[model samples]
Target: GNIVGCRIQHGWKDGDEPLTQWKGTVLDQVPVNPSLYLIKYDGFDCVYGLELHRDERVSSLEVLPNRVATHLAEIMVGKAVEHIFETEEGSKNEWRGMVLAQAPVMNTWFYITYEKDPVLYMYQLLDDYKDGDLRILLVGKQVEYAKDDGSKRTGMVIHQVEAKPSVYFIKFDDDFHIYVYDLVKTSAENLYF
Candidate 1:
């Protein structure tokens, strides 16, 4: 029997000619003759049925782990995430940009992006958090800053803080400005003094 959350790699057709290759998740399966299954395609809103053994086609199938099932559920419904920079390992990292979109199935593709940015970035739902521990918000800490026009400015507040390297993500009003400052514990202590 085919698993419900397993990914199905299949090809689409028009009449007798091959049309395009497609990927989808198994939503349901038929136990009777010819082995029919219901599949929901990636990026498509509708679900289609395919026979296991037919000329129209069945290509490859992949099964996902149980932990991925949990990830899928969380992302499918949606959550918030903070985008983080890359580490030395070259892996792209991010924090709770919270589920922007739902995954069609196990290991399926989805979209996430910053609120102010119009671009949509693609990401996969993993069973574990790629970044070790989650960071906490530091709502009212004072900070200093400047504008892109090269004019000096100050009175920026610490909107959030992420540990490990102790980076302070600052923001302010008037123009909805945002900035990042990397600081050691001593440097952060001096800011308050």
Candidate 2:
């Protein structure tokens, strides 16, 4: 059966800032094989039901190779994402376009994004490579402009990740501010979160 939605909650303890909470559904199965499948969340995706197999048949022998190749491709795609938002705090107000994508990386997970604006944004990626978890990556602010007194800004651009599940959080990295909320109040936009 396919999951259609999920619920999330958020709360902050005394003297503590709000901690972003993310929880949601995994949607339906996108079959990669009888024993493997792809799961899609609201703003992310992952894979599941993969069992290690050791066989001599041509078809069975190809499984590991295919998974490896696909995993590498996913990492390549993850490396391509960068933060591009640029706006002054409390001064910029606009709902810009945002995109989030995810893929398996060797035995891990990675996420990428493209967005409009110059402020902080939060995104989530559900990972199923292991026991099924959420991977978060935040792209920080781009405070400097590439062209002096012109139109272009110097923001951080993503290339490759160390592995799956980014670590840079709680602060902006280079160009834009990207936030990954681990806990969220589930809505239609992020059923899993």
Best by TM-score: 1
Tens digits of per-residue lDDT, candidate 2, 32-95, equal: 2232222222242222211113111112121111122155334444342333322324333323
Candidate 1 versus truth, CA RMSD in Å, comes to: 17.9
TM-score per candidate: 0.29, 0.20
Counted clashes in each candidate structure = 11, 28
Q: Model 1: per-residue lDDT, tens digit, 1-193?
A: 4466676565556567766777756654533322545455665533344553553345444444422245444434344556564534565665444334443453454434344332233444442334533221233554454557985454343323322234443433332223444454343422431
* C-alpha RMSD by candidate, in order: 17.9, 19.3
Q: Highest lDDT among the candidates is held by which one?
A: 1
Query: What 10-residue stretch in candidate 2 is worst by lDDT?
Result: 56-65
